[PDB]
């Protein structure tokens, strides 16, 4: 199926003293593989997956140079945006940037993205055609005019359709033992009385990868959302994910209810029944 490479950058100004806190993370699909933290000792791009460690010193020197250049751009941007929004030097503000590329089922370029936010709100985003910009407000419109004149979209399109997908395919081959392995959810149901008359059925999906999953309840073969609870997909901490869905049922009618589990690692969806 489809694969993604994505970089996430966060820079938070420190008006009391010193430079912004800068944190950069790189992912292939739902696997973190590199990090940079301005607060950490190394001042280097650091590996976070075994398959990136085989990259040589040229790679790490290059990624360190680039991530430091990214940090300085975000430091300057915090100053520029304070100016555009007529904000005082006293308050802490945040810039976020995300970019990356998807390859499709055919292993070719599928899509690219480059999105920017100020104080957690959309600022400017590259449109899907990688040729035009979405500017949320008149500050972002100023940036759009600047980026059009400097042909930023052309520079990012070249990276997103080329370099980005070449390196994504490199990482996917080098890390294939994990990156190209699906971990199907380990599923089970629990039961406990909430009253003399009612019981909660909880459908568990554990130790799955990638994170994308659907848990649905049916009663007598028809979807039920009423009297259900679905928790946000959460990390196990070992690179896999967890999720559960629960339904409250009349005690003795548990056999009417089925939990349906959809995941890329399941050739057919699973059906669980108490």
């Amino acid at each position: 199926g489809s694969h993604s490479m994505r970089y996430f950058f966060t820079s938070v100004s420190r008006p009391g003293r010193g430079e912004p806190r800068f944190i950069a993370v790189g992912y292939v699909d739902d696997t973190q593989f590199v990090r940079f933290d301005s607060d950490a000792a190394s001042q280097r791009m650091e590996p976070r997956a075994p398959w990136i460690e085989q990259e040589g010193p040229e790679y790490w020197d290059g990624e360190t140079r680039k991530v430091k250049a990214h940090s300085q751009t975000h430091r300057v941007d915090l100053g520029t945006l304070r100016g555009y929004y007529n904000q005082s030097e006293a308050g802490s503000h945040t810039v976020q940037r995300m970019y990356g590329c998807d390859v499709g089922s055919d292993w070719r370029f599928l899509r690219g993205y480059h999105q920017y936010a100020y104080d957690g709100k959309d600022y400017i985003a590259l449109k899907e055609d990688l040729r035009s910009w979405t500017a949320a407000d008149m500050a972002a419109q100023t940036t759009k005019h600047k980026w059009e004149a400097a042909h930023v979209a052309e520079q990012l399109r070249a990276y997103l359709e080329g370099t980005c997908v070449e390196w994504l395919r490199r990482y996917l081959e080098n890390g294939k033992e994990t990156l190209q392995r699906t971990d199907a959810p380990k599923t089970h149901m629990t039961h406990h009385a909430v009253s003399d008359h009612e019981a909660t059925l909880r459908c568990w999906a554990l130790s799955f990868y990638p994170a994308e999953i659907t848990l649905t309840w049916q009663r007598d073969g028809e979807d039920q959302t009423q009297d259900t609870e679905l928790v946000e997909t959460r990390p196990a901490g070992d690179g896999t994910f967890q999720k559960w869905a629960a339904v409250v049922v009349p005690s003795g009618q548990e056999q009417r209810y089925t939990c349906h589990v959809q995941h890329e690692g399941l050739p057919k969806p699973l059906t669980l029944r108490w």
Binding site: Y7, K66, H70, V76, Y84, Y123, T143
Partner: peptide, 10 residues
């Protein structure tokens, strides 16, 4: 692999 080209500021 990060973007190589010098980033344009906002």
């Amino acid at each position: 692999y990060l973007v190589v080209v010098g980033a344009v500021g906002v």
